[PDB]
Amino acid sequence: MAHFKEYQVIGRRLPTESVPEPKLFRMRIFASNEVIAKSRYWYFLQKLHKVKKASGEIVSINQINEAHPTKVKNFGVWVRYDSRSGTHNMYKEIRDVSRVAAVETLYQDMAARHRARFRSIHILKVAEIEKTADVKRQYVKQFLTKDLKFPLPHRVQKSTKTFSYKRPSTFY
Amino acid sequence: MKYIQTEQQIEVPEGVTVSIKSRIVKVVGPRGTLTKNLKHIDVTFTKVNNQLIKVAVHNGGRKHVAALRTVKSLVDNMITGVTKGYKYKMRYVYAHFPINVNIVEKDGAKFIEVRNFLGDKKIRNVPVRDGVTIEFSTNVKDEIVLSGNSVEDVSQNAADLQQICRVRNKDIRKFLDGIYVSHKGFITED
Amino acid sequence: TDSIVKASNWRLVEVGRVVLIKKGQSAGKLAAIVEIIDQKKVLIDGPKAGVPRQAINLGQVVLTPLTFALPRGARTATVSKKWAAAAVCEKWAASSWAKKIAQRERRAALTDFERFQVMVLRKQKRYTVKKALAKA
Amino acid sequence: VEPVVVIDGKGHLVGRLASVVAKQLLNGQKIVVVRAEELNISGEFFRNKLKYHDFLRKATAFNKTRGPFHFRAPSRIFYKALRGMVSHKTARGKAALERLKVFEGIPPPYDKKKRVVVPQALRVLRLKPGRKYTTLGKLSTSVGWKYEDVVAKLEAKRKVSSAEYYAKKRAFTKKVASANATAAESDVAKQLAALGY
Amino acid sequence: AESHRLYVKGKHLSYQRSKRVNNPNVSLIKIEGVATPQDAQFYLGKRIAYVYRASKEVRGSKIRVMWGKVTRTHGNSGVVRATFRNNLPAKTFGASVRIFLYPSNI
RNA sequence: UUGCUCCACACAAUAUAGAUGGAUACGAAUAAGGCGUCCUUGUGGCGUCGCUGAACCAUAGCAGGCUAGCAACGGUGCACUUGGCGGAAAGGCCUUGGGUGCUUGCUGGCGAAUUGCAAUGUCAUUUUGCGUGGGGAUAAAUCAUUUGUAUACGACUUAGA
RNA sequence: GUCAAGCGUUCAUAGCGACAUUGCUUUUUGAUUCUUCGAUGUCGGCUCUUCCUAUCAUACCGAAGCAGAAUUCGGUAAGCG
Ligand SMILES: [Mg+2]
Ligand SMILES: [Mg+2]
Ligand SMILES: [Mg+2]
Ligand SMILES: [Mg+2]
Ligand SMILES: [Mg+2]
Ligand SMILES: [Mg+2]
Ligand SMILES: [Mg+2]
Ligand SMILES: [Mg+2]
Ligand SMILES: [Mg+2]
Ligand SMILES: [Mg+2]
Ligand SMILES: [Mg+2]
Ligand SMILES: [Mg+2]
Ligand SMILES: [Mg+2]
Ligand SMILES: [Mg+2]
Ligand SMILES: [Mg+2]
Ligand SMILES: [Mg+2]
Ligand SMILES: [Mg+2]
Ligand SMILES: [Mg+2]
Numbered sequence A: 001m002a003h004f005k006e007y008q009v010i011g012r013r014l015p016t017e018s019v020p021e022p023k024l025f026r027m028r029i030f031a032s033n034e035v036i037a038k039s040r041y042w043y044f045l046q047k048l049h050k051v052k053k054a055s056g057e058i059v060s061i062n063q064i065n066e067a068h069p070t071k072v073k074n075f076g077v078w079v080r081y082d083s084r085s086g087t088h089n090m091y092k093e094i095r096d097v098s099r100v101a102a103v104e105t106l107y108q109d110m111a112a113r114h115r116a117r118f119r120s121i122h123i124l125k126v127a128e129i130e131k132t133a134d135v136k137r138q139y140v141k142q143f144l145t146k147d148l149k150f151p152l153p154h155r156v157q158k159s160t161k162t163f164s165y166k167r168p169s170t171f172y
Numbered sequence B: 001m002k003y004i005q006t007e008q009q010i011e012v013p014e015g016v017t018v019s020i021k022s023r024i025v026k027v028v029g030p031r032g033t034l035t036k037n038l039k040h041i042d043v044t045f046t047k048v049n050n051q052l053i054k055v056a057v058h059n060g061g062r063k064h065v066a067a068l069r070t071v072k073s074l075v076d077n078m079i080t081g082v083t084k085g086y087k088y089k090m091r092y093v094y095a096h097f098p099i100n101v102n103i104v105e106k107d108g109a110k111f112i113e114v115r116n117f118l119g120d121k122k123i124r125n126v127p128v129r130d131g132v133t134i135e136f137s138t139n140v141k142d143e144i145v146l147s148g149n150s151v152e153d154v155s156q157n158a159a160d161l162q163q164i165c166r167v168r169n170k171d172i173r174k175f176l177d178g179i180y181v182s183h184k185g186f187i188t189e190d
Numbered sequence C: 001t002d003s004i005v006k007a008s009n010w011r012l013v014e015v016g017r018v019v020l021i022k023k024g025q026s027a028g029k030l031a032a033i034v035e036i037i038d039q040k041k042v043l044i045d046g047p048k049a050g051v052p053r054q055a056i057n058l059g060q061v062v063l064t065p066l067t068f069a070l071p072r073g074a075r076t077a078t079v080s081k082k083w084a085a086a087a088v089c090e091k092w093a094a095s096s097w098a099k100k101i102a103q104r105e106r107r108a109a110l111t112d113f114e115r116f117q118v119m120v121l122r123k124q125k126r127y128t129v130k131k132a133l134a135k136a
Numbered sequence D: 001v002e003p004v005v006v007i008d009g010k011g012h013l014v015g016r017l018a019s020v021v022a023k024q025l026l027n028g029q030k031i032v033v034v035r036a037e038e039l040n041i042s043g044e045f046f047r048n049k050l051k052y053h054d055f056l057r058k059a060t061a062f063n064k065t066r067g068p069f070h071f072r073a074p075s076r077i078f079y080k081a082l083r084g085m086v087s088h089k090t091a092r093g094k095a096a097l098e099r100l101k102v103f104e105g106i107p108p109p110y111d112k113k114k115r116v117v118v119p120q121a122l123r124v125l126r127l128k129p130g131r132k133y134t135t136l137g138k139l140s141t142s143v144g145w146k147y148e149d150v151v152a153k154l155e156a157k158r159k160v161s162s163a164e165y166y167a168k169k170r171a172f173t174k175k176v177a178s179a180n181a182t183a184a185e186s187d188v189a190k191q192l193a194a195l196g197y
Numbered sequence E: 001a002e003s004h005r006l007y008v009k010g011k012h013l014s015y016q017r018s019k020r021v022n023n024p025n026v027s028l029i030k031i032e033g034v035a036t037p038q039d040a041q042f043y044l045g046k047r048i049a050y051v052y053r054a055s056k057e058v059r060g061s062k063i064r065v066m067w068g069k070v071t072r073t074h075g076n077s078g079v080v081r082a083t084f085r086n087n088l089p090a091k092t093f094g095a096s097v098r099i100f101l102y103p104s105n106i
Numbered sequence F: 001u002u003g004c005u006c007c008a009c010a011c012a013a014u015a016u017a018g019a020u021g022g023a024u025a026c027g028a029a030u031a032a033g034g035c036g037u038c039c040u041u042g043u044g045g046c047g048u049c050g051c052u053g054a055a056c057c058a059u060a061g062c063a064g065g066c067u068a069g070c071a072a073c074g075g076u077g078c079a080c081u082u083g084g085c086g087g088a089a090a091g092g093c094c095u096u097g098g099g100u101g102c103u104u105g106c107u108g109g110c111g112a113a114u115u116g117c118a119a120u121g122u123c124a125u126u127u128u129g130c131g132u133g134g135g136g137a138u139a140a141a142u143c144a145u146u147u148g149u150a151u152a153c154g155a156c157u158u159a160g161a
Numbered sequence G: 001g002u003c004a005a006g007c008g009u010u011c012a013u014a015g016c017g018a019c020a021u022u023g024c025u026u027u028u029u030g031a032u033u034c035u036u037c038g039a040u041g042u043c044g045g046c047u048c049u050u051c052c053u054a055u056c057a058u059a060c061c062g063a064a065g066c067a068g069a070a071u072u073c074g075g076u077a078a079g080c081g
């Protein structure tokens, strides 16, 4: 789950006599593997349509890679989650070079700030925010200023020995 | 949120020299000199053009950003105190017993001593802190004027003189007797 | 009459800052910061060394004193061209930091015969050094 | 790797130093800790003073001379923190605790010996900036230690002597560095530089 | 020379143990300068002496030796497991052992 | 019934929480410092360093023998000694000079074998005893008797050539 | 403890506080029958120690429908009675 992957999953709802060639529903799923992806596919299709895994089939599952994995992108994520007392819709902005990176950051962020588990979260939408000043959140907007530069004060240097002889420094 | 960079301006007037070794600030203007240890904040001072000093916080949370404007106000108070000084004027409020405030020597330690506060036989004593000058006003009755470079010292010594004359065991909406700060300003201002 | 405020000069996370990867696959190679993703993560690019363009935590990274002029979000061909124009590797090799890295790699590479020769030459230099000290 | 290791306890967190020292003692290393009045505990002073008074509260009710013995000196607070990280009721842990000496200040022999740090335990490497901390000399004085002023006087004396030592040591290393620089750019020194030396 | 050492020093740390049961048949050794299981893979199969002193000469020596061998690495930090011909006495917890350079590979 | 102590060296017995090249000395800060240099001597200017001790010192020679020179007047061991500093437990640190060896800084000569293909292959430091030869000093305590400032008995406080 | 209809000469909350509702305690009494029926001496008082704080007094304070006096509400506090 540190590497989520994104999959398109197309499922069908199996052809009967009255309906040959059914409607081919497609989802984008964030999962660790294809097993979890097909599981989540049937989870969301049993919430949208009158279908279930026993009366349907999977016709395709493909891993979608990121088109530009080394371009920095601003993402808006619309998410629905369960709290301890209700269900809430939430919009967050996440800055990464990948959609699965944004979704991993979202899951860590939701577990951190809201104590929301994976079982309580629906990703409603991930969309790359195409233009600056459509960026709503000011924790993202601070990284879009011109000629941005900052230091990292108080550098803590990792020691591999138990004892040090020098009384180290946190210069940087 | 951890704001990336929050930064405050500090304006130095012409006759003032500010020396900031690590976070120990020394401000030297015409009235004298002042020093403040600021090693409890973790800010970063820098000098722009010998009349402007930036102070900045990097990757600082809400409380750490809140302390930065405090640091700017502390160094501005140092500059204002060594340029203009501070002058706090207190009034004696009494109904029947006239509060008798004199300044006295006890072993060279320079005390304000207060007699007849609400008819008390107890002499009260507030030590004048170093830097604070006590004088008594002419053509304004019942006014004691505390002056000095350090607003901390002048304000705390005026607060000592106010808290030493608080009323015990009486309704203090009716027994208003005390010494109160009436004016806060500067020594040399117009 | 002069206001004196200390410098306290840090290395800035900025586009064009040269970084040394400590840990991972690259691990001792030079890259350059291409864009700042957030406070704890930047996009690096080390095409001379062989570092792929990647997102990385700054904790996998030590910044160097060396910068060069790079535009934000510059692609790998741009990074390579501007890195060669600024001649980053020749600034880096002349620093005392990279000489110490080369020194400890060289002392790691020494064989037993070379360690014996290091002992013999150190005693030979030591004799002259003690003569110079006792006449100065 | 030394026969005994002398830790200068200044700027160290008490638990993070005590677990490291407990593991060195049990693994067979003799440890002497100096400047235990300059140790740190994280969290504010009133916080840690209430913790000590909560500890001070508990004693054997029928005989206070057999109670938990509330030791007041900063070296003894460090010793108490390091017990409990050692099975001290066994012979092995008794022998481990016999490998440890903790002192306030730096007394003789150790004042002319190298002092080390434990960077796993350093307050400036472990605590987030802005986090409050307690100095163990101040805490010990608040809970009844008598000798804060004597240790400060002797440490000022020791530091005057140590600075007069270090002035002579810099005056010698000036000459040694210059004489090593005279031997540089010779056929032996370039031969040594070819081998990383 | 001033030194004649052809072994690496180590510390007998512990038996193999769970939280409450020990196994004296295996002993845990720290080797000086070894902080990594792959750095400690060099020492596998090396020949260990615990060298100790007794009052009674038995074959013209007051020095007695227990011989054993590094079997596998233990954990993440360069501790190894060792087995000896007779198990280590358990008062030697923290005592110094010798890891010889033979059987040699490199 | 030649007792006690100290010093040195001969041999024994007890052991050893565990020698195996060296515990290698600023202080302070860590949103700062170290070092070098310069001046106006400061909370100064300039340069440089860190990114770990992965260092530095030391380290060649029968467990390190015997011997011959060259260069230098350095390094180092042991005792003798001069002067000083050190009381936190100093019991150490820095010196002055003369001996006394050694030196791998450089170049030579001789020896090592059979411990038979590994078997720590014994080289450390506390207690003691006893032997020998070189100094030094020449007491108390307790019972018993006694006191009553003490006291169940012990103990305590007094006295007695 | 919360809520505040209402009382408090006007005024919900100085002090109170209905209709509701959330708790804590184990110094009451029930509920239970787990331990003891080859026996754990069963009421109260006397004596004596310690502990708790939900503080009556004493210390220092905040509030009042506290002018003074005398009270009332509340805080730290079990040091001492
Ligand atoms: Mg599922
Ligand atoms: Mg939150
Ligand atoms: Mg720093
Ligand atoms: Mg009052
Ligand atoms: Mg009254
Ligand atoms: Mg040398
Ligand atoms: Mg040991
Ligand atoms: Mg324990
Ligand atoms: Mg030291
Ligand atoms: Mg005290
Ligand atoms: Mg006491
Ligand atoms: Mg085990
Ligand atoms: Mg381990
Ligand atoms: Mg064993
Ligand atoms: Mg044991
Ligand atoms: Mg500098
Ligand atoms: Mg300087
Ligand atoms: Mg003494």
Ligand SMILES: [Mg+2]
Pocket: none
């Ligand atoms: Mg030699």
Ligand SMILES: [Mg+2]
Pocket: F148, F149
């Ligand atoms: Mg009597």
Ligand SMILES: [Mg+2]
Pocket: F151
């Ligand atoms: Mg009697």
Ligand SMILES: [Mg+2]
Pocket: G001, G023
């Ligand atoms: Mg409640």
Ligand SMILES: [Mg+2]
Pocket: G011
């Ligand atoms: Mg009202």
Ligand SMILES: [Mg+2]
Pocket: G038
């Ligand atoms: Mg029975």
Ligand SMILES: [Mg+2]
Pocket: G040
């Ligand atoms: Mg009974």
Ligand SMILES: [Mg+2]
Pocket: none
């Ligand atoms: Mg209470």
Ligand SMILES: [Mg+2]
Pocket: G055
């Ligand atoms: Mg009360």
Ligand SMILES: [Mg+2]
Pocket: G058
């Ligand atoms: Mg009283």
Ligand SMILES: [Mg+2]
Pocket: none
């Ligand atoms: Mg009581």
Ligand SMILES: [Mg+2]
Pocket: G080
């Ligand atoms: Mg009481």
